[PDB]
Amino acid sequence: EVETFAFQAEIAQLMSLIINTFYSNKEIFLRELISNSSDALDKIRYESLTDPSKLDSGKELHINLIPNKQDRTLTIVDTGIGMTKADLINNLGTIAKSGTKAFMEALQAGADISMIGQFGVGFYSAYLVAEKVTVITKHNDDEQYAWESSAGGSFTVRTDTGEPMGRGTKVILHLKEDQTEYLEERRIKEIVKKHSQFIGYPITLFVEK
């Protein structure tokens, strides 16, 4: 059962602006997605202080970067709080409507795309380098779900049947044909050290075979 939804016009217009605008500093996408995972891990860590049983789906709090050249995919995994079905379908999109309006107004007044995080809509920077994004997520209170969009105005949500996650969020970036530089170990290491050196969770960069 695959459900198809339309993006809000403002979010769709944001994704077009990200996809079409000429902007060479594309490497900031990794800073934003890693920043998103750190916040998800903060939320499960805070909630587990007043409730130790929330960590029954996994005690470890970490971020893993997994490149795959055969699939041409870069996967950012965290064991954060995850997102529910309502988070994917409309909760997180409606929050982003106000940040998108402010982000677009800032752009015409002299800002650039690298400040996208300051408006809380950093996730969409993934489309700087990916033609399709797959998000697999498992919240403690909901089932495992797969979100997917190739932009163009729509996204899909379905119950995930793959490997069970326990808890967290898996962002799979199906990279563009000319963005495979972000599969290189030495390139990922440089971006992590430059933009995310003080993240308070262990970041493991996986090596390919």
Ligand SMILES: CC(C)(C)c1cc(N)c(C(N)=O)s1
């Ligand atoms: C599309 C989906 C549900 C993956 C997200 C939208 C927003 N705005 C996210 C965020 N981290 O802000 S995640």
